[PDB]
Amino acid sequence: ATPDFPTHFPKSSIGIENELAGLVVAMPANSAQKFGYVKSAQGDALFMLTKDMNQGSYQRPPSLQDGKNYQNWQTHTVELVSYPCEMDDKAAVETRKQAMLWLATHFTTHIDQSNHQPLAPIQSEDGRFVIEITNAKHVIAAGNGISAESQGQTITMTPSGQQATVGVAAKGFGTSATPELRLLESAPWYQKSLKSQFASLTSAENLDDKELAANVFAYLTSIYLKTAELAKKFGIYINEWDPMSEQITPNANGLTDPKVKNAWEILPRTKPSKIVEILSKSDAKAVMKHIKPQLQSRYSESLSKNVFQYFQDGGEVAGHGINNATVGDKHSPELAILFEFRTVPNELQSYLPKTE
Ligand SMILES: Nc1ncnc2c1ncn2[C@@H]1O[C@H](COP(=O)(O)OP(=O)(O)NP(=O)(O)O)[C@@H](O)[C@H]1O
Numbered sequence: 001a002t003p004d005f006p007t008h009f010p011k012s013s014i015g016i017e018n019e020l021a022g023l024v025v026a027m028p029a030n031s032a033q034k035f036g037y038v039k040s041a042q043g044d045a046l047f048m049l050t051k052d053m054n055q056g057s058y059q060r061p062p063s064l065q066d067g068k069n070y071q072n073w074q075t076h077t078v079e080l081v082s083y084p085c086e087m088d089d090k091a092a093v094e095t096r097k098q099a100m101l102w103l104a105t106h107f108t109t110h111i112d113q114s115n116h117q118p119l120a121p122i123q124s125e126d127g128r129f130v131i132e133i134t135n136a137k138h139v140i141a142a143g144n145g146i147s148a149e150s151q152g153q154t155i156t157m158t159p160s161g162q163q164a165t166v167g168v169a170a171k172g173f174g175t176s177a178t179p180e181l182r183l184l185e186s187a188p189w190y191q192k193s194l195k196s197q198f199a200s201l202t203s204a205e206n207l208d209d210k211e212l213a214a215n216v217f218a219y220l221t222s223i224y225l226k227t228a229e230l231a232k233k234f235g236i237y238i239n240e241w242d243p244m245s246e247q248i249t250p251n252a253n254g255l256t257d258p259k260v261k262n263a264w265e266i267l268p269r270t271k272p273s274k275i276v277e278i279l280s281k282s283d284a285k286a287v288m289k290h291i292k293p294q295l296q297s298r299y300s301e302s303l304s305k306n307v308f309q310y311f312q313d314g315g316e317v318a319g320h321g322i323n324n325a326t327v328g329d330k331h332s333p334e335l336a337i338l339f340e341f342r343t344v345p346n347e348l349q350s351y352l353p354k355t356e
Pocket residue numbers: 005006007008009013014015016017033052081082083084085164165166167322325326336338
């Protein structure tokens with residue numbers, strides 16, 4: 001079994017995703033995404049081996065007929081998904097990049113001498129890295145996995161196949177305290193002006209934590225307003241809101257549609273309703289009550305009510321979120337909120353392995 005990601009980090013955390021070029025993985029239909037992982041010889045889990053983009057049904061080449069059953073098997077691209085580490089942990093970041101580059105060289109040899117065969121759980125020649133296979137019911141094949149033989153491909157990685165995910169303490173968003181927080185706050189959807197706006201609205205209110213309430217208000221309002229902008233731009237059905245009722249032609253297959261995810265640029269990966277927990281019951285009520293007019297002064301009543309209710313009932317920005325991640329003290333953990341960089345910016349390029 002592939003170990004689950006660790007959920008707790010002392011400070012800000014980072015994970016990476018790297019889709020490989022030059023090969024496919026073929027597996028039975030409806031298989032689990034994870035088929036293995038690479039760890040250090042010391043035992044530290046570095047990254048998972050996963051199936052990513054469905055490339056069609058797998059057809060075992062006739063010249064490689066082995067009496068085995070490959071019925072209903074599907075071909076997918078391979079994506080290497082790191083186990084998160086601390087953003088300032090240089091050795092952990094570097095070991096992940098080196099282990100990914102080593103595995104690409106190991107894949108290059110595998111498609112040359114063992115094409116259309118599963119990856120074997122081996123140790124690297126230098127003893128640094130160990131492959132563990134959690135699903136033996138798979139094969140690795142060069143190119144698109146149609147031909148028995150490769151085109152002598154070198155297994156590679158590129159910025160177009162790369163993402164980075166940053167986790168920070170939820171209470172930090174809007175404080176601009178660290179370079180990571182400042183990079184996240186530069187997200188085009190984030191409206192820092194909403195912080196001072198909340199303060200003006202709540203002068204007569206005796207709030208338990210005014211600065212924290214203002215930060216949460218700005219973060220949530222920015223997400224709710226951006227969701228409404230995207231639902232209108234792409235014609236997305238949100239709860240009971242019908243884009244066709246506002247003469248908008250549906251133009252995406254929901255919130256999880258890759259082009260909708262790309263429009264966020266810095267994609268929230270945590271369920272928005274979780275942040276309410278960092279506030280007192282009273283402060284959370286004051287924040288929530290003030291969001292509704294922000295939507296209603298910009299969007300129709302129906303779109304405003306549907307976006308508000310969707311996120312209130314625990315709606316996700318773009319499918320299954322990372323909602324159990326924590327930061328700070330291990331004994332008294334605080335909520336961490338995660339963000340996916342759809343395109344890795346210059347500031348995070350050093351966290352990604354480069355073939356060249
Ligand atoms: N606590 C954390 N802090 C920072 N990054 C994290 C943390 N937990 C997970 N990540 C990273 O966030 C990403 C998680 O993506 P994941 O949750 O596996 O979704 P997925 O199902 O693989 N995506 P998909 O391709 O749509 O199926 C990886 O880059 C992880 O390394």
